[PDB]
Design a protein around this ligand. Structure first.
Ligand SMILES: [Ca+2]
Ligand SMILES: [Ca+2]
Ligand SMILES: [Ca+2]
Lengths: 113, 100, 111, 101
């Protein structure tokens, strides 16, 4: 995969350096023929955490009527939440965490192959 | 409802100097004009007083001393936002902070 | 060119997420069989600026008695400096910039 | 000389709210005891007063308003560090801040 993207077997990931709000992050991944990182089987979050310094990264997870993976099922994992108005999901070394969608954060894109 | 609250994470036993920035909260009402912030709750304006403070003009929530998970595991704060004329531009927002 | 490392041509790079002072960043790349990034031909800094968001990254550039690339020649490019005691070099979007060697910054390794 | 100064990059026309953090400076003397920081220079304590301020106990250098490269392209500040008794733990350090266009 291209420069700035890193490979893990069959998976190609983009751990952004810049920060964007949730919607712009979703759009950046699509525009690059990829998608915001998801764990649709609700597995692998703890493991993946070993790749995340100390910052939070936007992932394809949102709460519109309960937490859901973008294009996937309902979240079955814990997500630490500070306030009820935090409706978009992020990941960091200690697990999943909610944040207001307008907040600029780094994001992670994923593409297969 | 125009509150914007970033993800708050904070380990116990942090090293200073203090105060140390946590996250910058804001109200999208600041698009119409400057907004001023304050916080209430235990750890803020009630015992343990002043452990958390907020920069009034910037919305920067900060912690003023090291924390001890075994002493106090979580804090519940409330954020407030007002306009130049001192009138509220948001209803208080409850913020639960868990000490990692 | 393992996970967290990125490839371009025959080169494999590590743009760190974590931060370390200059000596420790130099040691990290060495422990990984690589070296802190250098531009020994004094070329390519501008172009490389694209692979950098807005952060400063430690590279192999040092000022003991003058600016020099680690195991390379003298620096001949501009380097923004705030103070005379900033003796380690970093790179970011706008070019090279000096920093005190004790400051924790992200870093870039090259293999 | 135990000053530690991170790289300072500052563009003109920044939006608020203000004040905004630039870098956190410090003296390695803070290992021996508490250090208190201050800055002097035009832009700090001489006209234009207050454009730059520093948080006395943390060392956080901050800017208080948008800058205009066209009117002032650079600022020369001097940082100072003292012990609790007011005695100096460092000699002043000149810090040149260039405003990015
Ligand atoms: Ca404890
Ligand atoms: Ca201008
Ligand atoms: Ca200009």
């Amino acid at each position: 995969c291209p420069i700035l993207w890193t490979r893990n077997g069959s998976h190609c990931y983009y751990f952004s350096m810049e920060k964007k709000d949730w919607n712009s992050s979703l759009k950046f991944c699509a525009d690059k023929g990829s998608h915001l990182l998801t764990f649709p089987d609700n597995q692998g979050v703890k493991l993946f955490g070993e790749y995340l310094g100390q910052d939070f990264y936007w992932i394809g997870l949102r709460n519109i009527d309960g937490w859901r993976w973008e294009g996937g099922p309902a979240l079955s994992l814990r997500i630490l939440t500070n306030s009820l108005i935090q409706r978009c999901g992020a990941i960091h070394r200690n697990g999943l965490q909610a944040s207001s969608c307008e907040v600029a954060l780094q994001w992670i894109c994923k593409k297969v192959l | 409802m125009d509150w914007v609250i970033p993800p708050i994470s904070l380990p116990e036993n942090e090293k200073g100097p203090f105060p140390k920035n946590l996250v910058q909260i804001k109200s999208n009402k600041d698009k119409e004009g400057k907004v001023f912030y304050s916080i209430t709750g235990q750890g803020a304006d009630t015992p343990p007083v002043g452990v958390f403070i907020i920069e009034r003009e910037t919305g920067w929530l900060k912690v003023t001393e090291p924390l001890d998970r075994e002493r106090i595991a979580t804090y519940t704060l409330f954020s407030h936002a007002v306009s130049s004329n001192g009138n509220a531009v948001e209803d208080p927002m409850e913020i639960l902070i868990t000490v990692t």
